[PDB]
Amino acid sequence: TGGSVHSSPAIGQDGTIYVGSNDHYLYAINPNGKLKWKFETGGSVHSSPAIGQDGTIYVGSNDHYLYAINPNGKLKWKFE
Amino acid sequence: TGGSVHSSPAIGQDGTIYVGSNDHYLYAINPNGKLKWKFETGGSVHSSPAIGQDGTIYVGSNDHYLYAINPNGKLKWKFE
Amino acid sequence: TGGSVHSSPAIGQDGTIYVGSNDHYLYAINPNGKLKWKFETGGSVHSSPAIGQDGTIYVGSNDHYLYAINPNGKLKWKFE
Amino acid sequence: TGGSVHSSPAIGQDGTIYVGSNDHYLYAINPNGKLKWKFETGGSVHSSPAIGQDGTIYVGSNDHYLYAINPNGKLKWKFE
Question: CB-based contact (8 Å) between C31 and chain B?
Answer: yes
Degrees to nearest 5, angle at CA A55 with A51 and A60: 40
Strand pairing category for B35-40 and B50-51: unpaired
Question: Is the torsion defined by CA of D36, D42, D46, D47 positive or negative?
Answer: negative
Question: Looking at residue D69, what DSSP letter applies?
Answer: E
Any chains having at least 3 CB pairs less than 8 A from chain C are B, D
Contacts of A7 (CB under 8 A, 6+ apart): A19, A20, A21, A45, A46, A47, A48, A49, A59, D47, D60
Question: Is the torsion defined by CA of D47, B41, C71, C45 positive or negative?
Answer: positive
Comparing C-alpha atoms, which of A80, C18, C21, A59 is closest to residue B38? A80
CA distances from A20 to B52, C1, D12, D66 (A): 26, 30, 23, 10
Are residues C68 and C76 in contact, defined by beta-carbon separation less than 8 angstroms? yes
Q: Rounded distance, CA D15 to CA C20, Å?
A: 21
Q: Rounded distance, CA A33 to CA A18, Å?
A: 12
Q: Rounded distance, CA B53 to CA D29, Å?
A: 29
Tell me which residue in D2, D8, D27 faces C50 most closely, judged by beta carbons. Answer: D8
Are residues A28 and A38 in contact, defined by beta-carbon separation less than 8 angstroms? yes
| Cβ-based burial of B79 (10 A; exposed 0-12, middle 13-18, buried ≥19) | buried
Instruction: Name the residue ranges covered by the structural domains of chain B.
Output: 10-79
Burial code (b: 16+ CB inside 10 Å, e: under 16) for C36-68 equals bbbbebebbbbbbbbbbeeebbbbbbbbbbbbb
Contacts of A49 (CB under 8 A, 6+ apart): A7, A9, A10, A18, A19, A20, A26, A57, A58, A59, B8, B9
Resolution, angstroms, 1 dp:
2.3
Tell me which residue in B15, B29, B48 faces A79 most closely, judged by beta carbons. Answer: B29
Question: CB-based contact (8 Å) between C19 and chain B?
Answer: yes
* D46 marked among binding-site residues: no
Are residues D25 and C80 in contact, defined by beta-carbon separation less than 8 angstroms? no
Are residues C20 and C45 in contact, defined by beta-carbon separation less than 8 angstroms? yes
Side-chain-side CA neighbours of residue B44 (13 Å):
13
Tell me which residue in D47, D54, D79 faces A8 most closely, judged by beta carbons. Answer: D47
Question: Looking at residue A7, what DSSP letter applies?
Answer: S
Q: Rounded distance, CA A73 to CA A35, Å?
A: 11
| C10-79: CATH, from 2.40.10.480, 2.70.170.10, 3.30.590.20, 2.60.40.10 | 2.40.10.480
Q: Rounded distance, CA C63 to CA D40, Å?
A: 21
CA distances from A15 to A30, B20, C25, D51, D56 (A): 7, 27, 35, 10, 10
Question: CB-based contact (8 Å) between C8 and chain D?
Answer: yes
Q: Rounded distance, CA A29 to CA A57, Å?
A: 13
Render C10-76 in DSSP notation, one character per residue: EE-TT--EEEE-TTSEEEEE-TTS-EEEEEE-SS---SPPEE-TT--EEEE-TTSPEEEE-TTS-EE
* C6 marked among binding-site residues: no
